[PDB]
């Protein structure tokens, strides 16, 4: 799975954490919603609430995110949006 | 064209508005990001910030929404997620 960061307002290692977490999610689950759930819940845990996650191959978004807490990246064949409101 | 509401934590009126607003978006724009933008800005305009919108044919989500401010629906062959944090 190739990781490609598209848009990030977020620290280097927090970004790395998003990738690592997303990797674990893709290994366990195949359904986008469940994958999205995994990532969201782990970021709530490690970095405090409240995070939202979108995982898919085809979508556009327009969201307002708290600063230093936004990432949008591809991991293999899916795109992942993760952010604090 | 064909509206189908999948999950809604939102009044019946504001639901019907979300449909009407998304219909306007699809009439004006073709790109999902622009459609989502249109919907998000309009709902920020008429019902106060902060809204977030996702428009797509293939995605899953897991988000934390405000009570009475969450909807997820199809309109023609596109799915739409709209919510306040």
């Amino acid at each position: 799975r190739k990781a490609v960061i598209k848009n990030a307002d977020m620290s280097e290692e927090m970004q790395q954490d998003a990738v690592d977490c997303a990797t674990q999610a893709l290994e366990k689950y195949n359904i986008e919603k469940d994958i999205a759930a995994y990532i969201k819940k782990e970021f709530d845990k490690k970095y405090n609430p409240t995070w939202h996650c979108i995982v898919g191959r085809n979508f556009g978004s327009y969201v307002t995110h708290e600063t230093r807490h936004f990432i949008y990246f591809y991991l293999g064949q899916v795109a992942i949006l993760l952010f604090k409101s | 064209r064909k509206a189908v509401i999948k999950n809604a934590d939102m009044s019946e009126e504001m639901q019907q508005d979300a449909v009407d607003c998304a219909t306007q978006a699809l009439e004006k724009y073709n790109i999902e990001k622009d459609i989502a933008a249109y919907i998000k800005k309009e709902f920020d305009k008429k019902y106060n910030p902060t809204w977030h919108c996702i428009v797509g044919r293939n995605f899953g989500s897991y988000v934390t929404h405000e009570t009475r401010h969450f909807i997820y629906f199809y309109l023609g062959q596109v799915a739409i997620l709209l919510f306040k944090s």
Binding site: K6, D9, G56, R57, F59, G60, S61, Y62, T64, A79 | -
Partner: peptide
């Protein structure tokens, strides 16, 4: 401090 941004994918 909040910021607003759009994303688009089709892959």
């Amino acid at each position: 401090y909040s910021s607003t941004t759009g994303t688009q994918c089709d892959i």
